[PDB]
Structure formats: structure tokens, C-alpha cells
A paper describes a structure:
Family 1 glycosidases (GH1) commonly function as β-glucosidases and β-galactosidases, although other activities are also found in the family. Unexpectedly, the ancestral glycosidase binds heme tightly at a well-defined site in the structure with concomitant allosteric increase in enzyme activity.
Furthermore, there is a large region missing in the electronic density map of the ancestral protein from X-ray crystallography, while the rest of the model agrees with a homology model based on modern glycosidase structures. That is, the missing regions in the X-ray structure match the high-flexibility regions in the molecular dynamics simulations and include the proteolysis cleavage sites determined by mass spectrometry. Overall, regions encompassing two alpha helices and several loops appear to be highly flexible or even unstructured in the ancestral glycosidase. The ancestral glycosidase is highly susceptible to proteolysis and degradation is already apparent after only a few minutes incubation at a low concentration of thermolysin (0.01 mg/mL).
Numbering used by the authors:
A (entry chain A): 8 to 233, 284 to 309, 322 to 451
B (entry chain B): 8 to 233, 283 to 306, 332 to 454
Write the structure that this text describes.
């Protein structure tokens, strides 16, 4: 048996546009992914996030499923255009009411929020003026980050500025398979630069009103794909933790099994990566994403996804071997809590511990959900 | 009685985003008005054009209503993002199929198409790159105009480049009440400049394939709002075949203004003139299956008098189009302003001809009106 540290965080992760739905309800403005998934040829089978998991309306049931899972932490993202329909200025009280109710529901059931500010849903009004190529987007994000800290920070104490900014810059500005769908390295550089500045000014605004919580960033360090004043501002933004998203390693040759994404399953790469960061850097590490897509089928009311079981099992061995050698892994989040809209793959890729039937919105916990509940309860593995 | 020329065009007018619906169906990409109407605070009551009059699916019933009306011409717009979901590149075959079916349905009922290329629905993909502040949008519009000419021009003989480009530039870039919702005069200037260049490049592309149909543009010269020298001459190099006039008022009802303008265009310019828009919004209600919009009759009749006084003074008016054929999505006013000759109930999509439809039908049948001292 393999035990984890006592207060180790056990959670699952989602993202706003991937589960929320209610895209054009209750004062939410459109994001670039609303535009992207309404454009033919961009997303598998014309899927969009108009409805998604309808989590906006069904959050109470979803929080209750988290409690039965036994989570002590839940990673979600705030939809920027649900707070500021134009990215800045007018605030949506209804959007604030939703995340206040969500946060309070999580704490009522012993679940600690782990909130991501930007999870790729840039407000479309900002993209009309250039998006991340225009510095006024940086201003808007800082105002946006401020609003979230002031109204949610008394309850939220784990914050993330950006989810895989390195990946969005590549897929959105280099390969063009993600919005804003361009292929120009000079644009990618400018977008990346202002992403760093927006990160730094949000990190500083958090420290400037001083919450007992922490804030960091998340990166995937081996992903698989389908003037002067700014520099000083950027490097003065020291972190409290680093979030690691691991799925596979783009370097794998060894004949390995493959997921439903085509991704080779290679948990030892997680172990080494954890080691490499421990030697280079000393900050706390949270595995903010780790999961597997499976061709899941609801059977006789059940989904027997033992594939996903052994993937997470073998990856939770790798993290355990790392902590045994001093690496300060302080938490673990499965991607994902529920099947959802997986960007350009649409709904054809299921990562959830919980199956979602999109015709009925019925939630069916996968077998991995019942096994994960034991892992949290035992705080370890066999 | 006041009689019009034998070949005078009698029609009604619509615009793609205002009636079509099917906004995210059959290969259509989003327009800036899709984005605009999905943003809170931009459109009255949060209305949008997702469904509108569902004309995309109900076009054959609508064409049947046009023939009952007696129309010989019908002014509609082609949705640029229905032809090119991103404004340039891959062409949507289903979009070409729809307008081919529409035009063929019109001509089989003796109705002459009067097509507008740009009626305010810029593909959102091009707005992401700056929209009309970006010269690449000029290129995309030229290619767009070309595609339509090739696939539709063998049947279509009357073409409009832009509907009130002067109004869009003010409302989209100075006032900010229309998308892309900016308030900057220098941006209004640059957008205006690119619009004229795109107009000129499309006019010259039409002459390069030399279909002996006609090309022109539409302007409202009394709107209410309720140096690249090689460019500039390229603008002036784009001579017209006709001018389209949109008149509503100078909303004060003021038909004398119409006649005044018609002759000064006859004085100052000379092009054939089609009044491509004329109409009035009324608080229409269905009282037991009927709409008694006598107001709309008065407005039209009085304005049909002004055009008739101008024509017997030699003004070369060649056609007249009612705005609108049917109630529709009136931009930031949403569905709260009805301009149609035909009432549309948006819960059932049921079409109910108003009293003006029956009155306009007889005007066409008798090619004129009836007067008194």
C-alpha cells in the first residue's frame, strides 16, 4: 500500500466553457470559443458549448456528486465573459451570484475551491479589438482578476492565473487549430508577451490585497498537438506553487498502448518530470491535470472504464515514488470530473470520472469514480 | 389616378440577417451581428437573429406570398458568412444551394432578383483581424463578390454592393450603437475608406466578367440615427449603373423631402434611380386575424405621390421597393419595430398579410394610385 501526505489534496478539475452551458443566459457575453464552435469546420461534428453539461443549472447536483466522491478540493474556472460580458466595465451580478453559490456549496461539503481565472474563454469583445495582441486586453484582465479576488477571495484561497498559456499560444497563434485561429510567429510572440504581463499584474494585484491564500500557474511541459519596463514587471511575479498538467510525453521507439486520443500511456515520464522540477526548483507542486480519454459506453446503466482506472493507478504510483524521494507534490486533480466539451474534439472525447449523456444530461458515475472515492478515503493505493 | 411607367419595378425589400434564421445551420459562419445580439445590453430585450422569420426554411411560402402580392422584383441580401463562413477561402455549397433555390423560385414566379452583397453582416472571423480597419477585409470582399457573380449572375441582373455604407460607418465606428461598437473618428474614416475601395474593387470585378446586368449602391441621404492616391482614383474609377435611395424621413413623416431629393439627384447627378427602401414602423396588432395598418397605407401612398410628381418632371425613377416585405429583426431595436407589409408572429412563424399588403397588391395590378382634391 502507498500512502500520501496527510493533508494531500484530492480533487477533480473542470473548465467553465467545457461544462457550464447557459452560454447566452443570465447576462453572459460571448467568448472566442462561442464564435469558434459556431464556425463550420472548427470543431468535431459542429459541437458547441451552448448547453455542454448544463452545469450552470445543475451545479447543486454536481456538488453533491463531488461529496459522494469524497473530494476535498475542486478545480474550476470562472468564465470571464460571465463576469464582464465585454471583458471590462459593466459587471454581471447574476454571474457573481452563480460563483458565490458554487463556492459556498463547495465549502458546505468540505470541498476547497481551486479557481482558474483564464481557461481559454477570452471575451469576444476584446478579440474584436485584437485580443491578446492588444495591451488593453492586459488592462481588462487585471481589472477582471481584481474583481474575482475582491468578491471571492474571502472564501477562495487557491488561485490560478492561466491554464497552459504555453499551449494556447501555440494552438491559437502558431498552428491555428484553436481560436483566434492564426498562424504567425510574430503574432504568437506578441500574444505570449502580453500573456506574461497579464499574469504578472494579476499576481501582483493578488499580493496587493493580501489574502492568506496562494496563487500560481499551470503548464503542460510535453504536450502533444493534433519594452524594458514590461520585462521587469514580468520577472517580479514570483509564484506560490506550480501546477503541472501531465497526459503523456511527446517523445514516445517503445511499443506502448494508446488512449482514445492516440496518446501513448507513459507514467514514468510523470515521475521524471516531477523529479526534474524538484531539482531545478523548490516550490510546491500540484498535479492540476492528469487523465485519459476512453471510448466510454453506458451499458446496463454502468460504464466499466477499467482502462482509466489503471492509467490513474499507474500515474498515482509515479507521483508516490516521487514524493518518496522528496518532491513536494501537495495535491492531485483528475481531468476530468465529468465528460465535457473537449475544445476542437467536441464531445467525442470523454475524460470524466462521471459519464454525461448529453441528450438527457443524466450523470452516471463511472467505475473510476467509485475507485477514486476509495483512494481518497484510504489516502492511497494498493 | 397617377400611373407609373410600364416597366416600372414594384417590389419589397429584406436583408439576410433580419429574416433568414438558421444562423448556425447548413455551413453558415457567424456574423458580427450574431456576436452583437448575443451580448447583453446591445439589442432591445435581448432579441437575436438565430431564428428571425425562419425564412431560410420557409422561403417557398414567402415567395408564394410575393406572387400573391404581385411583385415583379424582390430585394434581398446574401449573407456573406453563409457563402464563406470565415469571409474567405472555403465556399459553403449548402449556402450556394439555398440562394440558387431562392433565385430560381423567384424567377419561376416572375419576380426579378435585386441582390445586395453587403447588408451589415460582416463575417466575425474578419472582425477578429480588425474588420473594416484591415485592408485584408477589402480583398475578402472582392473575392466574395466574385463568387456570387459567377454562381448567381447568369440569373441575377441587378446588384447592390453596400446598403447604406454611410450609416454603418457612423453607427459602428462613431456612435457605437452598432457592431463593432467603437467610438473613434479616425477609425470611422479608415473603415469608410476601406468600404469605398472594396465597393470599387467589386464593381470592377463585375465589369471584368461583363454580365449585362446592372450594378450600383444604396444610400440614405437624410438618416435620423434614432493619401494612398492610387486608392482614391481607384474609388472614382467605379462608375455606377444606378443609385439606390433609402428614404424614411428627413420620425417625422415628410414625403415632400423625398420629392425634393429625387429632383436634385436628377439635377446634380444622373443615374437611373431605384428607391430601394421606403416604409414606416407602426405598433401593429392582430385584432382577430387582421392588421388594420391604415397608417402604413397613408405613408406609402403619400410617398408614392412624391415619386410620381418627380417622374412626370423627368426624374428617371425605375423602381420602388417597400421596406419591409415582412416584419423582421430590426437591428438594435430587435423585433419591437414592425415595418412589414406582412405580419409575422414569432411564436408560431405564422404570416398574416396586413392591410397594406392588400392595398399594395392593387397598386401593382393597376400600376398606379387613386387621388382626390
Amino acid at each position: 500500500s502507498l500512502k500520501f501526505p496527510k493533508d494531500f489534496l484530492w480533487g477533480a478539475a473542470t473548465a467553465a466553457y467545457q461544462i457550464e452551458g447557459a452560454a447566452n443566459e443570465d447576462g453572459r457575453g460571448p467568448s472566442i470559443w462561442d464564435t469558434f464552435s459556431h464556425t463550420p469546420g472548427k470543431v468535431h461534428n459542429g459541437d458547441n458549448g451552448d448547453v455542454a453539461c448544463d452545469h450552470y443549472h445543475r451545479y447543486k447536483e454536481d456538488v453533491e456528486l463531488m461529496k459522494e466522491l469524497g473530494l476535498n478540493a475542486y478545480r474550476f474556472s470562472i468564465s470571464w465573459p460571465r463576469i464582464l460580458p465585454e471583458g471590462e466595465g459593466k459587471v454581471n451580478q447574476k454571474g457573481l451570484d452563480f460563483y458565490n453559490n458554487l463556492i459556498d456549496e463547495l465549502l458546505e461539503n468540505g470541498i476547497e475551491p481551486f479557481v482558474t481565472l483564464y481557461h481559454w474563454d477570452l471575451p469576444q469583445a476584446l478579440q474584436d479589438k485584437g485580443g491578446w495582441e492588444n495591451r488593453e486586453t492586459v488592462d481588462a484582465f487585471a481589472e477582471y482578476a481584481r474583481v474575482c479576488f475582491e468578491r471571492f477571495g474571502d472564501r477562495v484561497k487557491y488561485w490560478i492565473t492561466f491554464n497552459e498559456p504555453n499551449v494556447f499560444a501555440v494552438l491559437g497563434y502558431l498552428s491555428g487549430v484553436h481560436p483566434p485561429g492564426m498562424k504567425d510567429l510574430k503574432k504568437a510572440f506578441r500574444a505570449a508577451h502580453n500573456l506574461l504581463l497579464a499574469h504578472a499584474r494579476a499576481v501582483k494585484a493578488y499580493r496587493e490585497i493580501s489574502q492568506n491564500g496562494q496563487i500560481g500557474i499551470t503548464l503542460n511541459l510535453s504536450p502533444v498537438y493534433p519594452e524594458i519596463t514590461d520585462e521587469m514587471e514580468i520577472l517580479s511575479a514570483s509564484l506560490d506553487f506550480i501546477g503541472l498538467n501531465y497526459y503523456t510525453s511527446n517523445l514516445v521507439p517503445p511499443d506502448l498502448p494508446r488512449t482514445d486520443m492516440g496518446w501513448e500511456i507513459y507514467p514514468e515520464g510523470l515521475y521524471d518530470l516531477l523529479k526534474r522540477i524538484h531539482e531545478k526548483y523548490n516550490l510546491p507542486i500540484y498535479i492540476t491535470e492528469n487523465g485519459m480519454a476512453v471510448d466510454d459506453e453506458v451499458e446496463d446503466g454502468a460504464v466499466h472504464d477499467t482502462n482509466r482506472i489503471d492509467y490513474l493507478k499507474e500515474h498515482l504510483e509515479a507521483v508516490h515514488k516521487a514524493i518518496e524521494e522528496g518532491v513536494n507534490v501537495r495535491g492531485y486533480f483528475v481531468w476530468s470530473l465529468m465528460d465535457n466539451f473537449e475544445w476542437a474534439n467536441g464531445y467525442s472525447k470523454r475524460f470524466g470520472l462521471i459519464y454525461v449523456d448529453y441528450k438527457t444530461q443524466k450523470r452516471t458515475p463511472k467505475k473510476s469514480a467509485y475507485w477514486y472515492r476509495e483512494v481518497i478515503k484510504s489516502n492511497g493505493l494498493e
